[PDB]
Amino acid sequence: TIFEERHLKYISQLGKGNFGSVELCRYDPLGDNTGALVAVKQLQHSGPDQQRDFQREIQILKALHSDFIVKYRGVSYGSLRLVMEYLPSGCLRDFLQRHRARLDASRLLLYSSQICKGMEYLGSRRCVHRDLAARNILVESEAHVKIADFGLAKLLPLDKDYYVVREPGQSPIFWYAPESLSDNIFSRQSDVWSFGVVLYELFTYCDKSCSPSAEFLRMMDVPALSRLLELLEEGQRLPAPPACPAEVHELMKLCWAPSPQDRPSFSALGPQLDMLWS
Ligand SMILES: *CCC(=O)N1C[C@H](Nc2ncnc3[nH]ccc23)CC[C@@H]1C
User: Which residues carry this modification: Phosphotyrosine?
Assistant: First the structure.
């Protein structure tokens, strides 16, 4: 659970995100290149708010125990770094693009069921992910996906089922629920809206030409956020992906219900995805 700074050997950059970076390191106490590979997150540059938010992320991940959530390994102190298991297949978005001629509808349904099971578990922990997208899902194997990146995650108080953010988000706007776009309201029901966008991503194999951004922009002087909110309020939605099974498209539409209270729960979605055959 405690990793010594001097034994973590830098190998390469895995990613850069919101005020932080994830690096591939080898935890090599023998110094002979035989140690295990780990994914290590740290804050890129100082900030008091970012530091509090980083400690929050570590506290959230440390207490999550699911086959469908990236495993917390430990921390290194200077909390300097968050140590996690390394998944060499990487993000689901790039994985789907490379293996599209190999993965069938059954396989996409299996991934959908696994993400929905991880999300049902997050909900049971009163955790709001706030950044669910195929780029934030990791691939353990050909038949196993895991939710990652809890950098924007929040724990709901026992007496409040949503939360309000002071400043508007910094993520691509095409995954946000209408209530998040209009009032900065986030809940487990806005994670359900984002999951509908994840299902769309899976069934387009994350093809850039019909991505949520390429397609919403194509359907779209007025600000882009306000224009997307206008489209959504009118009842306009992303179209059924090419060759998408009708039942899968119908589920995406339920996730995209205008009112958060009308969206299905992750517990109700789960058996439905499993019935379609995971
Ligand atoms: C989309 C490109 C991609 O693979 N990622 C994931 C990467 N994070 C990561 N990779 C492997 N193992 C891990 N364990 C925890 C986090 C990771 C960061 C950049 C992008 C999003």
Answer: 86, 121, 162-163
Which residue, among 15, 10, 3, 35, has the nearest Cα to 25 in the 3D structure?
A: 10
Pick the residue whose CA is nearest to atom 2 on ligand 1: 91
The experimental method is: X-ray
Both tokens of 26, joined, read 């080898």
Mutate to test the pocket of ligand 1, among 138, 146, 208 (most ligand atoms within 8 A of CB): 138
Point out the ligand 1 atom lying closest to the alpha carbon of residue 91.
4
CA distance 157 to 99: 41
Resolution in A: 2.0
Residue 238, phi then psi, degrees to nearest 5: -60, 140
CA distance 213 to 219: 10
Query: SS3 string of 157-215?
Result: CCCCCEEECCCCCCCCHHHCCHHHHHHCEEEHHHHHHHHHHHHHHHHCCCCHHHCHHHH
Instruction: Please report, in angstroms and rounded to a whole number, the separation of the first and last CA atoms in the chain.
Output: 34
| Rounded Cα distance, 38 and 105, in Å | 32
Structure tokens given for 60: 């959230």
Q: Give the residue among 253, 227, 121 at the shortest CA–CA distance from 174.
A: 227
Q: Is 146 annotated as a binding residue?
A: no
Structural domains in the chain, sorted by start: 1-86 (3.30.200.20), 87-278 (1.10.510.10)
- Chain centroid offset of residue 16 CA: 15
